[PDB]
Design a protein around this nucleic acid. Structure first.
Length: 231
DNA sequence: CCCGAAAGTCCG
DNA sequence: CGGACTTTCGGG
């Protein structure tokens, strides 16, 4: 069965505008886990737009198929484009897509893809269906996969006043001993971000609970100005 | 334009 | 460890 024509067209059009000179530092930035064509986001967005203008966005029946086929291509720009395309199908994504999103998180995994899946797509789903959080988050924390663990930490990133504080701090407690940079840093990020909404609660938490040095430092990067640094 | 964010390197 | 600095991207 041939590649979906929309995906074939995108592959052809991206490849015709590849930049091997830029591809080398772009690949180094992601610690050489992926090949790159060398196309940065503004042009990549336009090249996708070109193909949508010519071919139209595929019928929603093929949405998951398109994403998978792009996910399976070697160069990282195709996963970046896949996430752009998923946003165009946003209104069609719901709680039944959580396993599909899980599988994107644990394949071709790195911070660039995972951070574009978790606080937005999964965040929105669990905001609407908070009763489903306990069907997934305990498994993610217990798994060997650091990107599912990072997903558990960051899905509430943008919740602001809708943050479930007890849940957030419980998740962080489960993962606070991790020696993995991407877990320590995710903990720092979500605390720093939530501190923009509720600085008193984050300050109390970090002064009175164990965290990796990196996590605490990142958490209070801004709010330490509000409370001061004791001698 | 600006600022803040994932990262990243380089150094003491 | 953590500070100083780097580009790229999202967003006000």
């Amino acid at each position: 069965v041939p590649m979906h024509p929309f995906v074939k067209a995108l592959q052809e059009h991206f490849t015709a505008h590849q930049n091997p000179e830029k591809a080398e530092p772009m690949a180094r930035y992601m610690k050489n886990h992926f090949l790159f064509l060398g196309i940065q986001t503004p042009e990549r967005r336009q090249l996708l737009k070109d193909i949508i203008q010519i071919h139209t966005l595929p019928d929603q029946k093929d949405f998951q198929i398109i994403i998978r086929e792009l996910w399976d291509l070697p160069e990282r720009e195709f996963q970046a484009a896949a996430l752009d395309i998923m946003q165009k199908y946003k209104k069609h994504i719901n709680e039944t897509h959580i396993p599909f999103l899980e599988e994107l998180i644990v394949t071709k995994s790195w911070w660039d893809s995972v951070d574009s899946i978790v606080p937005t797509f999964l965040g929105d789903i669990f905001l609407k269906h908070p009763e489903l959080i306990s069907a997934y988050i305990p498994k993610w924390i217990a798994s060997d996969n650091i990107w599912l663990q990072r997903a558990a930490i960051l899905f509430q990133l943008k919740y602001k006043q809708k943050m479930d504080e007890e849940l957030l701090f419980w998740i962080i407690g489960q993962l606070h001993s991790s020696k993995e940079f991407f877990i320590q840093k995710a903990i720092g990020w979500v605390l720093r971000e939530y501190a923009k909404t509720n600085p008193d609660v984050v300050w109390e938490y970090v002064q009175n609970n164990e965290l990796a040095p990196l996590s605490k430092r990142e958490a209070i990067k801004h709010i330490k100005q509000n409370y001061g640094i004791n001698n």
